[PDB]
Write a protein that binds this ligand. Structure first.
Ligand code: PEE
Ligand code: HEM
Ligand code: HEM
Ligand code: HEM
Ligand code: HEM
Ligand code: FES
Ligand code: FES
Lengths: 254, 432, 179, 29, 254, 433, 181, 27
């Protein structure tokens, strides 16, 4: 997706970290809104209690898991969810699985195929998710004012969608910035009641759920950055000691 | 050992003498680490040690990852997520193996272009060059089959396209393709055999590396001047050289450490930058993504493959004179392999008597054009096939072939070289 | 005498056959296994769709396209003369092998409303992106940029052949057999 | 001349191995 | 496996082969009788036309296949069986799958654990299968007539079964040659009509299924015999020519 | 190289000039294959070549089988049936790999007991013996992990027993067992790691074999007299020796063409005889078979494991003196490994100066007792652990240790050897006059 | 006092290389420790009212079998018959009772009537399932892998196993069930 | 006396890697 909104997220940069409360807000948004259509087949429910995530108490995760029910391998029959289960598959077969969506999408491109924009801005995944959620305008582009598809909605961030031939170009390719997406506009202001009394605008919820889906895609981002710093420090010290050893040694060859 | 005058190993400890009389393992190790090395080597000689590192890393991480991965088309992707998500350190181990393949191809492209510039392929070194080409071909197959194993969209459609290349061979090609697939399409038979071969080929690479080390020990190392070490006497050899341990071991390990500082910085803070987001989508045989782009180290060859469409004049000629036995498809496959073949033949294509390129004032121009051209081929590989990229990729491919097939044979017949130093000692002293 | 090296080559001979016969099974085990050979024939029938859109169906590990074409794409003036194609064969299993790459020889129906194909690019096997993609209508292969027209005929890029039309026939006006 | 003793050796050894494996493929001992 | 009757099956020994007619009879008996309980989940239906097996014609194998109902492994819908399907799993939950039973049982032992009896007699799996099927007497052992376990039947061949306390010797040792098996006596005289008018005794049917079950456990036994002979012939020729070469060489030094 | 006077390689053709001046790989090949070898080697020297064949048979069949096998507990056994049933020649390729392991282990025991008889472990050959022991250890691990892969009943319960052995190790052992298993029980993590390690260790075996071959080129071969080849001159050396090519290559390749004729007869006509039929039953973690027997080549050590119980007096003593740290369980584990280690220590335990057992009239008795005792340990490992088999197992286990730890140290003091012949040439001319 | 700075530097760079190696090696070992299977907490209960006297029942937990048996009169009789000093292991391995009790058929039964015995079906020698059906000379269970004998209380009587079959945390809770885990 | 600098050097390098990789990354 081109021209994604560059949202500042707290996990960005080498010192960035997840806001646990933003993750819990995003979990609520997913559970109440997105989980009706989409699924997360690769996420174990128990991971909601583990460090660096929402870090919920295990009894809350157990209560949460009990809302699901699954065809258990040994019953062959519907059995209430346990923390060892994964999140269910997408209930709507049309709706993509979200377990990796924040890694499976690029928001930033080029310039001119060089990959430098991604080199400073990152891949742009949760920014793309946020841009799609925020991407439904009030009014179509008016190019197909009487002529747009019925089962689809114009979204200014989405690029893979259908286009009306009156919006399409042979000379170019496409007039409009976006395209038409099969997902209905999922968010509305105050749609989710944040028990914290936090801002429940479309903007706020879209950030919160994009941060949650980032954690869903990279639940060990925190440990990865910590290991990065540890390894960089070891190799910095060792590089300096090796440099001085090399200089002392080759000073003999002079 | 190498034909440089040197001191042989001498056992002195009681255990050393007990062992040396039974198995001269310490003598072989000593000869290996103590080899007299030209004292004037610059930083381009580090890449052999970085390559050895990359091989060791990719093996050790692969063996560990193979304890958790499942080579079956219903569990492969899920088992990679299990590695990413449940295994202790599994996220880091996988990002190490995935980025380590990029580190490995970087270090071989710099190691190759060093050898091309300083003439390290010239006589007597043609054998170490040929073993290097076998190592490189084995790396290409190893990395491709490794990239099929996650069974994402890029894994599946890459496996499709690449096995399709063998189908392009006239007559027999369909047989080779169905033998590589195990069937009419990419499926579980393909994934399972590609897993086995990806496990196997790193050990093949290792045995070739052992032969490669033995070959350059048998000649001795080249150096930036291209003038050989004086074989006359210990006294002269010691002026041209210094023992590899400690001096160059410490130099190379220093360079390795500072290089890996950046490697671990990437693996920590931006491990997905070099990859493709689309391989985080499960393989779907019914729809190819709209971003079909090889891993980056194959892009020059993919660019050469794409450059030869059916309107290209040379393709039309070949199609005519072959009476249709060659077509744009097969011509593209022949060109994409010719690009590596012609590089393997460089010891015989370069007619010049002068070894090092720094004394070859015309050669410098065409070499830097080749290095830029290899960058262009990498970049056009990522672009679409529209104008102007069709022209750019065609011109780039033509320069790649013209360098080895025309420019190198001509230059050795017409170039007016500079005079190299009398000795490595002289060069070292002149620079301090 | 020379009857020495007669024997020495005979023993060498028993060796290279016994070894040659030992090596072939290690190759032949990679040829298609009996399950994969059994999947080479399948029977199926598939139903109706609105015009201006395409379906997809799996067979033999690969997609079958079924497009019901628009008025602009059933007609296209039939404007393409047989002398301006890259591939002039119908590539059609339902007609003779001497058929030409003509609009009606490509379609399954008489009006040219129904086009059934392998969804497989004849270059190296990627799925051509449809809708009305590419610069000749029809499709565009994302892997190496081959362009197919509204009849699935190759117009530009590395591909040698028109998109092959499988053995297929209507059962009802609503449904089509593939096997 | 000399080479047909070598090559005839090679061929004789070749055909004899094949022929005997063929015979046993008739299965009648 | 208890000590078996040494049935002279035609497939035994290096030259032994499967009788195609006996295989077809055994298939008929399995179809009419055993498939009520026992699965063959490793046997693909298409193998019924395979060379060296029953070699049924392909349309007849297809007709056979359609009698099964298969939950389609991709569609979820139930459908008629196809030659590409396997035989069903065991319908009765505790009935063992018969795909490998002729290899998973030994009929011959020792003496003294030396294994030489198996060296002459083979593993004896088909003979064990035959011995179980023929092993139900008309009435129990005279001991413990008041104590037979309900739902079980005495079988002379079966050794893994329960035994009444009254039939154990004080060391916890089985007095009876057989033991009680959960399998009711499956064969009965003329139970299956062979259309050619072949013998339909229990002995005939038990032998025919034992042969069919041997083929089910090793469909390529024939090909294995032939690979055996051809390898043995190559290595015989090579051995002799190497021996003469060795003799000529070593004659030259003594 | 070996100290034996010999001709070096010289490159003849122009291509040999061109290559030899660059990479002396043809020189190394020649110098290996032309090694001067004692004239008097009998048929017990074939087994090294047969082992070098077994290693390749196992590698190439394994690599091929790994193209079709799936290392997952839901799929493994079914994938082995797919190999047996759908793959071209897959039944042969499987039986070749499975029986080829038995061929590998009978060839190593003949190679080992050859060395134990002719004193090929004695100085200067101690290094070759140690590398041989490392090879044998890697074979044992490789074959165990391979036998777990088909995931039948015997795979599962064998893996269960053998990972328990590490749980016997006091203190650390439960951690080691858990780290092996990847969990509290034998499960999919165990199968998947055992697959990766079964792939890795054959290359380790090969890399040790290269060193072992070096170990015997640096010393030269032993021979049935134990008398070394004369280094004094090329004339005397040639009187004691012939080049390995062609004479011994053709002799050993002939013997290999016979031992494979019998191997292919077994694989053709009775491939299941060495197997255990219960491994054609899928793994059932809730139901152990009526008799768990590890496959035949492990039985002598499994006999030594079962031989020691809390009823045994030396176990009671060890228990007492260790304050119960050495229970019978850990005692049996220590005994089972100690039986392999004490065979590794034989170069230092045999105090006798005479090399060939042929001239050691008392040693011959105790050697043939050891040879029979290894058979008894193999056979008794298959029997039930009841009377009298408990006694037979215990007495056999005792003799195994008594041979290496007592009899060999004592004989080198007490024995009165026969005098060997003066040189290999004399022995050869005594037989082949 | 001159080559002291050289040696100090050369050993400091060796020590930093050692630490940089130790950190590089430990993850390759630690990856083999339990990963997802750390989920050892679970719960189950079983319908004990199915079981007739003399019948043995099994259920899975923690990847392993748990036995249940409705003991026979004779199984209780021979159980009590053992004097504590005859046992190889005198300690009643039962986590439900407090640790350090004595194995006397009273600290090894799930309810005071002595009807019910519950155990891991797992031989304490090397983990094989010991075969029940009043097998073994002692009329309890027989370990097929190494010949280890248990009596009708699950107490080790002969063979290489060190201790009595362990009893998990199990209480009937209902007159027709037992709860475990 | 000997090893005054050899041992001391080794621990000085090892500890510095352990310290500066831990504390500054963690805090
Ligand atoms: C030599 C090159 C320098 C390497 C030194 C740096 C190694 C990284 C050490 C480190 O920071 O910790 C490694 C960290 C261990 O996991 P945790 O920190 O406990 O996180 C939670 C796990 N579930 O992650 C890793 O496994 C990465 C290191 C892999 C070992 C190196 C690759 C093998 C060669
Ligand atoms: C020459 C050395 C090697 C190279 C160049 C190489 C290359 C690769 C590449 C590029 C991938 C794809 C990673 C990704 O994008 O997700 C991969 C995956 C994989 N490799 Fe390797 N590899 C090497 C050695 C090995 C070895 C020896 C093994 C086995 C012991 C191994 C095991 C695996 C496995 C199991 C995967 C799939 C799981 C995963 O994605 O991590 N690798 N390899
Ligand atoms: C696994 C990958 C490889 C490894 C580990 C490796 C290792 C080495 C090492 C250690 C050296 C000596 C030090 C140096 O010159 O940097 C060397 C030199 C050399 N390598 Fe490689 N190499 C690899 C691949 C290649 C490739 C792909 C080529 C080219 C096709 C090549 C050709 C050469 C040449 C020409 C030399 C110079 C020899 C001399 O100076 O006499 N190698 N290599
Ligand atoms: C030292 C050499 C080797 C030995 C002694 C050995 C031993 C074994 C054994 C005893 C089995 C069990 C066979 C059975 O009873 O079904 C086995 C199975 C297996 N082996 Fe090996 N093996 C060796 C090398 C290899 C290699 C290099 C591979 C390559 C991956 C391999 C792949 C396999 C596979 C996939 C199986 C499981 C499928 C089967 O049962 O055939 N083996 N191995
Ligand atoms: C992979 C398995 C092995 C292979 C391929 C192998 C290979 C060989 C070969 C080719 C020879 C020379 C010919 C001969 O004496 O038979 C040899 C000799 C020898 N091997 Fe091994 N071997 C293996 C395992 C072992 C083992 C397990 C041991 C004992 C622990 C051992 C100890 C010896 C000794 C002592 C010699 C005689 C050395 C001498 O005479 O100087 N080897 N081996
Ligand atoms: S695969 Fe279709 S254009 Fe190349
Ligand atoms: S495993 Fe239980 S008796 Fe040994």
């Amino acid at each position: 997706g081109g021209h994604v909104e560059d949202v500042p997220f707290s996990f960005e940069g080498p010192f960035g970290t997840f806001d646990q409360h933003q993750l819990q807000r995003g979990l609520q948004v997913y559970t109440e809104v997105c989980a009706a259509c989409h699924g997360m087949k690769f996420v174990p429910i128990r991971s909601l209690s583990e460090p660096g995530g929402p870090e919920l108490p295990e009894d809350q995760v157990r209560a949460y898991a009990t809302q699901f029910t699954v065809t258990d391998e040994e019953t062959g029959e519907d059995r209430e969810g346990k923390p060892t289960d994964h999140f269910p598959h997408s209930a709507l077969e049309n709706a993509p699985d979200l377990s990796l969506m924040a890694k499976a999408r690029a928001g930033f491109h080029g310039p001119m195929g060089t990959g430098i924009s991604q080199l400073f801005n990152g891949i742009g995944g949760p920014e793309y998710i946020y841009s799609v959620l925020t991407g439904f305008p009030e009014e179509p582009p008016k190019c197909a004012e009487g002529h747009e598809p019925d089962g689809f909605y114009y979204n200014r961030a989405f690029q893979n969608g259908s286009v009306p031939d009156t919006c399409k170009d042979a000379n170019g390719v496409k007039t409009t910035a976006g395209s038409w997406i099969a997902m209905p506009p999922p968010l509305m202001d105050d749609l989710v009641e944040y028990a914290d009394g936090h801002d429940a605008s479309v903007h706020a919820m879209a950030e919160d759920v994009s941060a949650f889906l980032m954690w869903a895609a990279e639940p060990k981002l925190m440990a990865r950055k910590q290991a990065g710093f540890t390894a960089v420090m070891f190799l910095t010290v060792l590089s300096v000691l090796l440099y001085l050893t090399n200089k002392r040694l080759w000073a003999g060859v002079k | 050992m190498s034909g440089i005058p040197h001191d042989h190993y001498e056992p002195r400890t009681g255990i050393e003498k007990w062992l040396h009389s039974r198995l001269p393992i310490v003598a072989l190790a000593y000869d290996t680490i103590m080899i007299p090395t030209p004292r004037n080597l610059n930083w381009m000689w580090i890449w052999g040690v970085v390559l050895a590192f990359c091989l060791v890393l990719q093996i050790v991480t692969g063996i560990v990852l193979a304890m958790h991965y499942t080579p079956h088309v219903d569990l492969a992707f899920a088992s990679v997520e299990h590695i990413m998500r449940n295994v202790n350190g599994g996220f880091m181990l996988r990002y190490l193996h995935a980025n380590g393949a990029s580190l490995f191809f970087i270090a071989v492209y710099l190691h190759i272009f060093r050898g091309l510039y300083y003439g390290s392929y010239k006589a007597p070194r043609e054998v170490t060059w040929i073993v290097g080409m076998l190592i490189y071909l084995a790396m290409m197959a190893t990395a491709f089959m490794g990239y099929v194993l996650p069974w994402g969209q890029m894994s599946f459609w890459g496996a499709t396209v690449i096995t399709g290349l063998f189908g392009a061979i006239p007559g027999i090609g369909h047989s080779i393709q169905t033998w590589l697939l195990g069937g009419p399409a990419v499926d579980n038979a393909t994934l399972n055999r590609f897993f086995s071969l990806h496990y196997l080929l790193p050990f093949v690479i290792a045995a070739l590396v052992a032969i490669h080390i033995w070959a350059f020990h048998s000649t001795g190392n080249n150096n930036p001047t291209g003038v050989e070490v004086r074989r006359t006497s210990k006294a002269e050899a010691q002026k041209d050289t210094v023992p590899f341990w400690p001096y160059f071991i410490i130099k190379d390990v220093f360079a390795l450490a500072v290089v890996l500082l950046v490697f671990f910085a990437i693996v920590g803070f931006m491990p997905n930058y070099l990859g493709h987001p689309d391989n985080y989508i499960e393989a779907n045989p019914l729809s190819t993504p709209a971003h079909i782009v090889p891993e980056w180290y194959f892009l020059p060859f993919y660019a050469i493959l794409r450059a030869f469409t059916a309107d290209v004049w040379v393709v039309q000629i070949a199609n005519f004179i072959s009476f249709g036995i060659i077509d744009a498809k097969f011509f593209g496959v022949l060109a994409m392999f010719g690009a590596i073949l012609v590089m393997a033949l460089v010891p015989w294509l370069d007619t010049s008597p002068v070894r090092s390129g720094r004394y070859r004032p015309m050669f410098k121009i065409y070499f830097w054009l080749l290095a830029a051209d290899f960058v262009i081929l990498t970049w056009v590989g990522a672009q679409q096939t529209t104008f102007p990229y069709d022209w750019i990729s065609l011109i780039a491919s033509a320069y790649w072939f013209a360098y080895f097939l025309v420019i190198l044979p001509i230059l050795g017949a017409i170039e007016k070289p500079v005079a190299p130093p009398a000795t490595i000692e002289e060069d070292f002293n002149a620079h301090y | 005498g020379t009857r020495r090296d007669f024997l020495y080559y005979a023993t060498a001979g028993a060796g290279a056959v016994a070894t040659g016969a030992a090596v072939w099974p290690l190759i032949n085990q990679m040829n298609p296994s009996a399950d994969v050979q059994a999947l080479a024939s399948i029977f199926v029938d598939v139903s109706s769709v609105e015009p201006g859109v395409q379906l997809t169906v799996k067979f033999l590990g690969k997609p079958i396209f079924i497009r019901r074409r628009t008025e602009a794409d059933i007609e296209l003036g039939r404007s393409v003369q047989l002398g301006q194609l890259v591939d002039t064969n119908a590539r059609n299993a339902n007609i003779d092998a001497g058929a030409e790459a003509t609009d009606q020889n490509r379609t399954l129906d008489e009006a040219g409303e129904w086009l059934v194909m392998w969804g497989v690019c004849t270059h190296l096997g990627c799925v051509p992106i449809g809708g009305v993609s590419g610069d000749f209508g029809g499709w565009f292969c994302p892997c190496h940029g081959s362009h197919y027209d509204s009849a699935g005929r190759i117009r530009k890029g590395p591909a040698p052949e028109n998109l092959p039309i499988p053995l297929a026939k209507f059962i009802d006006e609503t449904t089509i057999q593939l096997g | 001349w000399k080479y047909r003793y070598r090559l005839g050796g090679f061929a004789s050894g070749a055909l004899l191995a094949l022929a005997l494996a063929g015979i046993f493929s008739t299965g009648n001992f």
